[PDB]
């Protein structure tokens, strides 16, 4: 790498909402506090709530109730 043309590459300490701390090198600043990480993101469960959204006869039986 060429000297003194790239920004500072200081290692920071990030952490999501669940408390999963990881050490990364980036250009953020002093530290980092995140709200979601890949080991806690609802992507293995957010695909479950996208396909199971259909149905009308089951809702129609919630009005007739017999």
């Amino acid at each position: 790498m060429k000297k003194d043309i790239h920004p500072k590459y200081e290692e920071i300490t990030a952490s999501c909402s669940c408390g999963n701390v990881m050490k990364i090198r980036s250009t953020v600043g002093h530290d980092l506090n995140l709200d979601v990480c890949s080991k806690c993101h609802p992507f293995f469960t957010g695909k479950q709530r996208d396909v199971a959204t259909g149905g009308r006869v089951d809702r129609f039986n919630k009005r007739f109730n017999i």
Binding site: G54, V57, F64
Partner: protein, 79 residues
């Protein structure tokens, strides 16, 4: 958004299609009850609804239960 106690249907349409299910998927029912709500026990039939001058054939699926028969019959044409 109406009729909280029991979905609406006519005697003449309820007694016709209840007689139609045991006779297979026979001839379309020529009916004028656009106000009748659709139940899960008419799915598959080609019942025809009078839009004002003809009876348009509509193929009822599973989802169309909250809607009435007069939803799918265009009464007023435009170009």
């Amino acid at each position: 958004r109406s009729l909280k106690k029991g979905p609406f249907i006519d005697l003449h349409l309820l007694k016709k299609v209840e007689k139609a299910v045991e006779s297979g998927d026979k001839k379309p029912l020529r009916t004028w009850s656009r106000r009748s709500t659709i139940f899960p026990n008419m799915i598959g039939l080609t019942i025809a609804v009078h839009n004002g001058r003809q009876h348009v054939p509509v193929f009822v699926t599973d989802e169309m239960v909250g809607h009435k028969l007069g939803e799918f019959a265009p009464t007023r044409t435009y170009r």
